[PDB]
Protein backbone atom coordinates (compact mmCIF):
# COMPACT_ATOMS: atom_id res chain seq x y z
CA UNK A 1 0.00 0.00 0.00
CA UNK A 2 3.04 2.24 0.52
CA UNK A 3 3.65 2.24 -3.27
CA UNK A 4 0.82 4.74 -3.61
CA UNK A 5 2.54 7.35 -1.38
CA UNK A 6 5.66 7.44 -3.58
CA UNK A 7 3.45 7.68 -6.72
CA UNK A 8 1.54 10.45 -4.94
CA UNK A 9 4.65 12.51 -4.12
CA UNK A 10 6.01 12.04 -7.63
CA UNK A 11 2.74 12.55 -9.52
CA UNK A 12 3.36 16.20 -10.39
CA UNK A 13 6.73 15.87 -12.12
CA UNK A 14 8.52 18.26 -9.72
CA UNK A 15 10.41 15.53 -7.85
CA UNK A 16 13.09 13.05 -8.86
CA UNK A 17 13.26 10.85 -5.69
CA UNK A 18 11.13 10.14 -2.59
CA UNK A 19 11.14 7.61 0.26
CA UNK A 20 9.31 6.63 3.44
CA UNK A 21 11.77 5.14 5.96
CA UNK A 22 10.82 3.60 9.28
CA UNK A 23 13.31 4.68 11.98
CA UNK A 24 12.06 3.05 15.18
CA UNK A 25 13.88 -0.15 16.29
CA UNK A 26 15.46 -1.23 13.00
CA UNK A 27 15.55 1.44 10.27
CA UNK A 28 14.33 0.25 6.87
CA UNK A 29 13.10 1.63 3.54
CA UNK A 30 9.37 0.97 3.31
CA UNK A 31 9.09 2.38 -0.20
CA UNK A 32 11.39 4.40 -2.46
CA UNK A 33 11.69 5.34 -6.16
CA UNK A 34 13.61 2.57 -8.00
CA UNK A 35 17.02 3.07 -9.56
CA UNK A 36 17.51 6.28 -7.63
CA UNK A 37 19.24 7.40 -4.39
CA UNK A 38 16.97 7.19 -1.31
CA UNK A 39 16.42 3.48 -2.05
CA UNK A 40 19.98 2.92 -0.78
CA UNK A 41 19.50 4.71 2.56
CA UNK A 42 21.34 2.85 5.34
CA UNK A 43 20.51 2.47 9.04
CA UNK A 44 23.74 4.38 9.86
CA UNK A 45 22.58 7.31 7.72
CA UNK A 46 19.14 7.30 9.43
CA UNK A 47 21.05 7.32 12.68
CA UNK A 48 22.63 10.65 11.84
CA UNK A 49 19.29 12.09 10.78
CA UNK A 50 17.61 11.41 14.13
CA UNK A 51 20.79 11.76 16.21
CA UNK A 52 21.78 13.88 19.18
CA UNK A 53 24.31 16.06 17.29
CA UNK A 54 22.20 18.80 15.75
CA UNK A 55 25.03 21.22 14.95
CA UNK A 56 27.86 18.95 13.72
CA UNK A 57 26.56 17.83 10.31
CA UNK A 58 26.35 21.61 9.77
CA UNK A 59 30.05 21.99 8.84
CA UNK A 60 30.65 18.40 7.75
CA UNK A 61 27.27 17.78 6.09
CA UNK A 62 25.77 14.27 5.76
CA UNK A 63 24.83 11.51 3.32
CA UNK A 64 21.60 9.89 2.19
CA UNK A 65 22.08 6.84 0.01
CA UNK A 66 25.79 7.50 -0.35
CA UNK A 67 25.00 10.97 -1.65
CA UNK A 68 26.58 13.88 0.30
CA UNK A 69 24.14 16.59 1.21
CA UNK A 70 24.42 19.98 2.96
CA UNK A 71 22.20 20.71 5.93
CA UNK A 72 20.88 24.20 5.29
CA UNK A 73 18.19 24.30 8.02
CA UNK A 74 17.60 21.78 10.84
CA UNK A 75 14.28 21.54 12.75
CA UNK A 76 13.77 17.78 12.57
CA UNK A 77 13.24 17.43 16.35
CA UNK A 78 11.45 20.75 16.79
CA UNK A 79 7.94 20.71 18.14
CA UNK A 80 5.65 21.70 15.29
CA UNK A 81 8.00 21.94 12.33
CA UNK A 82 9.52 18.44 12.26
CA UNK A 83 11.45 19.20 9.09
CA UNK A 84 14.99 19.52 7.82
CA UNK A 85 16.18 21.20 4.62
CA UNK A 86 19.20 20.09 2.67
CA UNK A 87 20.77 20.77 -0.69
CA UNK A 88 22.71 18.21 -2.67
CA UNK A 89 26.42 18.86 -2.19
CA UNK A 90 27.49 18.88 -5.80
CA UNK A 91 31.00 19.66 -4.58
CA UNK A 92 32.02 18.16 -7.91
CA UNK A 93 30.28 18.84 -11.20
CA UNK A 94 27.40 21.29 -10.99
CA UNK A 95 23.80 19.95 -10.66
CA UNK A 96 22.22 20.71 -7.25
CA UNK A 97 18.87 19.75 -5.83
CA UNK A 98 16.79 20.68 -2.82
CA UNK A 99 15.92 17.94 -0.38
CA UNK A 100 13.55 17.87 2.59
CA UNK A 101 13.37 15.19 5.32
CA UNK A 102 10.22 15.26 7.49
CA UNK A 103 9.66 13.20 10.62
CA UNK A 104 6.59 11.51 12.01
CA UNK A 105 6.08 8.96 14.76
CA UNK A 106 7.50 5.91 12.98
CA UNK A 107 8.78 7.36 9.75
CA UNK A 108 10.85 9.89 7.86
CA UNK A 109 9.42 11.07 4.50
CA UNK A 110 12.20 12.08 2.11
CA UNK A 111 11.72 14.19 -1.08
CA UNK A 112 14.10 15.37 -3.82
CA UNK A 113 13.08 17.93 -6.41
CA UNK A 114 14.14 18.10 -10.02
CA UNK A 115 16.75 20.67 -11.17
CA UNK A 116 15.53 24.19 -10.49
CA UNK A 117 12.46 23.33 -8.35
CA UNK A 118 11.92 25.87 -5.52
CA UNK A 119 12.89 24.52 -2.09
CA UNK A 120 9.69 25.56 -0.34
CA UNK A 121 7.75 23.66 -2.92
CA UNK A 122 9.59 20.49 -1.89
CA UNK A 123 9.16 21.51 1.76
CA UNK A 124 5.40 22.00 1.37
CA UNK A 125 4.98 18.66 -0.37
CA UNK A 126 7.04 16.74 2.17
CA UNK A 127 5.44 18.42 5.16
CA UNK A 128 1.86 17.91 4.17
CA UNK A 129 2.28 14.18 3.57
CA UNK A 130 3.89 13.68 6.97
CA UNK A 131 1.10 15.76 8.44
CA UNK A 132 -1.33 13.20 6.89
CA UNK A 133 0.78 10.36 8.21
CA UNK A 134 0.89 11.48 11.86
CA UNK A 135 -2.83 12.24 11.97
CA UNK A 136 -3.31 8.64 10.85
CA UNK A 137 -1.10 7.53 13.75
CA UNK A 138 2.01 6.97 11.63
Amino acid sequence: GWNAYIDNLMADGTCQDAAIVGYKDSPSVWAAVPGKTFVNITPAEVGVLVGKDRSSFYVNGLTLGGQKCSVIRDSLLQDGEFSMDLRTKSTGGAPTFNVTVTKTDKTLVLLMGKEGVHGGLINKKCYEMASHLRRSQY
Binding site: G1, W2, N3, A4, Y5, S28, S136, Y138
Partner: peptide, 9 residues
Protein backbone atom coordinates in the same frame (compact mmCIF):
# COMPACT_ATOMS: atom_id res chain seq x y z
CA UNK B 1 -1.68 10.86 0.93
CA UNK B 2 -4.01 7.77 0.42
CA UNK B 3 -5.15 5.43 3.35
CA UNK B 4 -2.32 4.05 5.60
CA UNK B 5 -0.68 0.98 4.01
CA UNK B 6 -0.07 -2.23 6.01
CA UNK B 7 3.14 -2.70 7.95
CA UNK B 8 6.26 -3.76 5.96
CA UNK B 9 6.49 -7.46 4.78
Amino acid sequence: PPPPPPPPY
